[PDB]
Design an enzyme around this catalytic site. Structure first.
Site, short mmCIF file in Angstrom:
data_model
loop_
_atom_site.label_atom_id
_atom_site.label_comp_id
_atom_site.label_asym_id
_atom_site.label_seq_id
_atom_site.Cartn_x
_atom_site.Cartn_y
_atom_site.Cartn_z
N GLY A 11 0.81 -1.21 0.00
CA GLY A 11 0.00 0.00 0.00
C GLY A 11 0.84 1.26 0.00
O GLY A 11 0.53 2.23 -0.71
N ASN A 12 1.93 1.26 0.79
CA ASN A 12 2.85 2.40 0.78
C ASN A 12 3.52 2.59 -0.57
O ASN A 12 4.05 3.68 -0.82
CB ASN A 12 3.93 2.22 1.86
CG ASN A 12 3.41 2.49 3.26
OD1 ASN A 12 2.31 3.02 3.45
ND2 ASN A 12 4.21 2.13 4.27
N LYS A 124 -11.15 -4.33 10.17
CA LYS A 124 -10.56 -3.30 9.32
C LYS A 124 -11.35 -2.00 9.44
O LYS A 124 -12.51 -1.95 9.02
CB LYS A 124 -10.53 -3.76 7.87
CG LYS A 124 -10.01 -2.69 6.91
CD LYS A 124 -8.57 -2.33 7.25
CE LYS A 124 -8.21 -0.94 6.75
NZ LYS A 124 -8.13 -0.89 5.26
N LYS A 209 -4.30 -8.13 0.88
CA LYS A 209 -3.73 -8.22 -0.46
C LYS A 209 -2.62 -9.26 -0.53
O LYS A 209 -2.38 -9.84 -1.60
CB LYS A 209 -3.21 -6.86 -0.92
CG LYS A 209 -1.81 -6.57 -0.42
CD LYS A 209 -1.43 -5.12 -0.42
CE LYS A 209 -0.21 -4.88 0.46
NZ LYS A 209 -0.57 -4.76 1.91
N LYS A 267 2.46 -10.44 6.14
CA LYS A 267 3.30 -10.73 4.98
C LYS A 267 4.02 -12.06 5.15
O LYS A 267 4.08 -12.86 4.21
CB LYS A 267 4.30 -9.61 4.74
CG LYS A 267 3.62 -8.27 4.49
CD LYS A 267 4.56 -7.30 3.82
CE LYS A 267 3.80 -6.06 3.37
NZ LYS A 267 3.33 -5.26 4.54
#
Lengths: 312, 312
Positions: A11-12, A124, A209, A267
């Site tokens: 996202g970053n 979220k 994601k 991750k």
């Protein structure tokens, strides 16, 4: 020779903290990412996935602020971000590679399971910050779940596990023809069957994601999953004289060391799932190192091919 | 036997006049359209394009109302509508056909020419209605063109001709594998090269969905272009005792009769362009008649195959 690569953009990578969610700000970050990703395009079969946090968040804010019409549900907002982000990635990449290299941005529906525990534990945050008064009203009127946010409140939505990606066959057919495919944007559009398993509908949720990219790489029989992050590796002894970057690790060792928890947890968990499911390698690292990543010379490589842990 | 079909869905096919632009209202119209379109899917190669007027209009309203961040440009809004509408079409169609039938919704960039006369004569109204005071401020600050709208004003944007669709090769490759492809949504995402012809960028414009669908059908070597509209045909002597539906007409005759002007002008002009460019047939008619249209038994068929005019 050739490899089938799934790159999951962080996202970053599209919007940094502290800058507004504008098209101009996103495009300059996409251009930086495209310059890096294009270095591993030649000779390979490249799939690009990405997050959508700030983008879907802004759509939620704009829809909530606009009182004249009832705003779209979160699955539909997800679809809109796939168009917005995919368009920019495709356009920036196309300006860098020979125009003969075909591109396709595919909308990606992802099935989730109605019995997923995320639906009883939404996590979220999304949308504006509400007073107690307004949060109460919206919970009662719409059935929303909320979370405290300081002395105020925010809506929270479920983040269920991805179960299947609908458009795998088209993606494979495009890769076989040399297309660079942008898909699974934002983790995919969350969809769910009714109880009978007959009718597919959207569901108000988000999908992580990296878990979706892991599933995508599994279902596409990718050679490598690259989880692109700000950091260049996972580290042991972080902040200490014995600090060491992890070059390669078996999932068993990463779990023992506690990497499946922490800020890198999701991750690492997605990389572990890919490695266990496929016997192929997932690498957590930086887009700046993407060539070295595909050469086995950078990033934290998560693989069942070798037990234990190797540093660099 | 098999035919390659491009169906261009009208804007009224997704949202009727007099109902709010909500996901629920769009979905019920998409479901009606999908039920009709699915009747010509078996054995054929089907491409579905669509408009985006109310959808892109609402995004423009929501972005203009939200003052905290500068809203996205119109090309990016176009991309978002391709995600929103394509998602719904794909999901509704998939609930109707055997799940073996593959689907793909492709984001569609369309090149336009910088020398297009539309850039000196913007025509498409978009965004909120402004007072003279606010319209003046925005014209001076942003360079916008406006049009009178009663005693108030609205921004107008160029509607240039489509020149090329970027993702033709992926669409063809998917059709060859039996995929139903949704693309050219909203007329496509308008894009334009810089003066040097080196760098592709978005442009703030809209593209007419029927002209784009005509170009799409040309570039895909489609057998038939179906321009789906509310009316079941073009008519001569409309509203008179000699009123007659047109079954088939050569472009030369349609132009003589004045059909390239009027309320049906843009659809007739797109059908004529397809017919002249390809020697194949464009049919203007109703989705309710789509099977009969493919059989040559309904709609106004625009073709150079036979001179003159035939009624039914």
């Amino acid at each position: 020779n050739a490899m089938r690569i799934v790159v999951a953009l962080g996202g970053n990578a599209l919007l940094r903290r502290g800058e507004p969610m504008t098209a101009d700000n996103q495009r300059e970050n996409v251009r930086i990412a495209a310059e890096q990703i294009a270095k591993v395009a030649p000779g390979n079969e490249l799939v690009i996935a990405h997050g959508n946090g700030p983008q879907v968040g802004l759509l939620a804010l704009q829809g909530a602020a606009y009182d004249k019409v009832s705003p779209y549900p979160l699955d539909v907002l997800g679809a809109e971000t796939e168009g917005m982000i995919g368009y920019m990635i495709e356009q920036e990449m196309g300006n860098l590679l020979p125009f003969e290299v075909p591109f396709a941005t595919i909308l990606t529906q992802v099935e989730v399971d109605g019995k997923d525990p995320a639906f009883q534990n939404p996590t979220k945050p999304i949308g504006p910050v509400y007073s107690r008064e307004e949060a109460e009203r919206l919970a009662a009127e719409k059935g929303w779940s909320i979370t405290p946010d300081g002395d105020k409140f925010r809506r929270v939505v479920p983040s269920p596990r991805p179960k299947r990606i609908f458009e795998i066959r088209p993606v494979k057919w495009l890769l076989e023809k040399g297309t660079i495919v942008i898909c699974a944007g934002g983790g995919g559009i969350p969809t769910m069957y009714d109880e009978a398993g007959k009718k597919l509908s959207g569901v108000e949720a988000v999908i992580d994601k990296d878990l979706c990219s892991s599933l995508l790489a599994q279902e596409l029989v990718a050679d490598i999953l690259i989880i692109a992050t700000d950091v260049d590796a996972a580290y042991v002894d972080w902040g200490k004289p014995t600090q060491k970057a992890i070059a390669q690790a078996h999932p068993d060792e990463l779990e023992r060391l506690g990497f499946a928890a922490g800020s890198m947890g999701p991750k690492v968990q997605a990389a572990i799932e890919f490695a266990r499911a496929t016997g192929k390698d997932a690498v957590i690292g930086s887009l700046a190192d993407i060539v070295a990543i595909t050469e086995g010379k950078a990033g934290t490589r998560v693989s069942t091919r070798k037990a234990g842990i190797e540093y660099r």
